[PDB]
Amino acid sequence: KQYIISEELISEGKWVKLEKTTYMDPTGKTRTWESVKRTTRKEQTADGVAVIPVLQRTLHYECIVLVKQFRPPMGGYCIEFPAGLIDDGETPEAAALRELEEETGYKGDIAECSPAVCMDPGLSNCTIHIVTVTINGDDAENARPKPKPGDGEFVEVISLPKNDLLQRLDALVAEEHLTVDARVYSYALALKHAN
Amino acid sequence: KQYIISEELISEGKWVKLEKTTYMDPTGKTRTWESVKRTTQTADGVAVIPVLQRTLHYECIVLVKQFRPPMGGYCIEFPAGLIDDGETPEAAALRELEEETGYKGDIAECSPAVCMDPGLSNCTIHIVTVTINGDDAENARPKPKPGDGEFVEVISLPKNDLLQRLDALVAEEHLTVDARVYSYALALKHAN
Ligand SMILES: CN1CCC(n2nc(-c3ccc(Oc4ccccc4)cc3)c3c(N)ncnc32)CC1
Ligand SMILES: CN1CCC(n2nc(-c3ccc(Oc4ccccc4)cc3)c3c(N)ncnc32)CC1
């Protein structure tokens, strides 16, 4: 019943652009919206991947590996899933294992890959694949995890036990001036609610 | 070693503006970033995690099918809205639920501010966990009274079957599932 009428460019940046989206509401009455799009069209279906990295060791609890980055848009540090944009002609799976090794230094294995899911639907058309990845911590490969962080990327690795995640996050928020990614907190909330 | 230096406005909209953020990296080398901010409260809005509890049934997660102009399509998300001036996130969550879904809920817990799009925006929300006694009379005929210009379809999915039930909806229609909803569902399988 609803659909897009027009998409008028307001301002194009280097990385991202702002557009006035005119659309038809269900009452046959037009409205507008301020929408964000990346300046460079994605060849790949979806824009990026968020990696859910599970650090599995014998004689240890299963840990979820997160990244503490300084995030200019936020003006602070955020705790997020290792994430990055998909290189042109590269499977989401390939991308997830690349972005993990780069951000954390961990060499993992695929578990499963989400369809494209919207990151910020009320602002952006950003879609990602949530890729579930296993890490064999007992393996030698993951003894000395050597990150290949790529240029201008300054990542601190934070592995937290799956069993205690939500409470362990609440502790880090209160203990530092930090912010948790909504998807990391959504994930952690489900782990408590599941048990 | 890292901090924001300056913020040059690129373009201001009615609702949202784009700014060139100059910042210091840890090596004492300055970089730039394109950041989005509201043109105009601790956090910005709430996402409601509404658990429909009925006896002799599986717990359902109540979701909303909204048209999202930025996406050019319909998205399946948690009931969400902006926090009204001088209003608790809890108040907001129970208001936005009743408005979008017609359900009267009870608070379970409220997340701290969590960044919605840290690589783009300074948008934070409170993820509010809410229980719904479907057996109760108040929730017998759930009549959504949605705000003007808000056109929400309610979709209840069984909690037990969520991830598989989502994958089915994506493949079966031209729809998109919100990353936060999919994150929740993924954790339900991964848990224990
Ligand atoms: C009542 N009425 C309803 C529409 C409401 N509304 N909000 C936005 C909007 C979208 C995303 C957004 O993201 C943030 C949030 C915080 C920080 C940085 C980015 C902020 C606002 C919008 C728009 N883009 N176009 C038209 N209407 C818009 C206004 C209030
Ligand atoms: C190597 N490579 C170079 C570009 C780097 N980069 N990416 C972005 C960026 C951020 C958010 C974004 O959101 C989307 C995505 C899809 C659809 C709609 C919105 C898009 C791009 C960025 C920026 N805004 N400012 C400065 N550098 C930026 C990253 C690392």
Author numbering:
A (entry chain AAA): 14 to 208
B (entry chain BBB): 14 to 53, 57 to 208
The authors write:
Their name derives from a common substrate structure, nucleoside diphosphate linked to another moiety X.1 The characteristic NUDIX box is shared between family members and contains a sequence motif “GX5EX5 [UA] XREX2EEXGU”, where U is usually valine, leucine, or isoleucine and X is any amino acid. In particular, the nature of their physiological substrates remains an object for debate, e.g., NUDT5 not only predominantly hydrolyzes ADP-ribose (ADPr) to AMP and ribose-5′-phosphate but also exhibits activity against 8-oxo-dGDP, 8-oxo-GDP, 8-oxo-dADP, 2-oxo-dADP, and 5-CHO-dUDP.
This observation is in line with the cocrystal structure of 1 bound to NUDT5, suggesting that the warhead does not contribute to inhibitor binding. We confirmed direct binding of 9 to NUDT5 by SPR (KD ≈ 250 nM) and solved a cocrystal structure of NUDT5 in complex with 9 at a 2.29 Å resolution, suggesting a similar binding mode as observed for compound 1. By contrast, superimposition of the NUDT5 and NUDT14 cocrystal structures in complex with 9 revealed some notable differences: although the main π stacking residues of NUDT14 (Y17 and W34) appear to be conserved in NUDT5 (Y36 and W46), 9 is sandwiched between W46 and W28 in the NUDT5 active site. R51 is not conserved in NUDT14 and seems particularly important for the establishment of ligand H-bond interactions in NUDT5 as shown for ADP-ribose and TH5427 binding. Importantly, we validated NUDT5 cellular target engagement for 9 by NanoBRET (EC50 = 1.08 ± 0.07 μM).
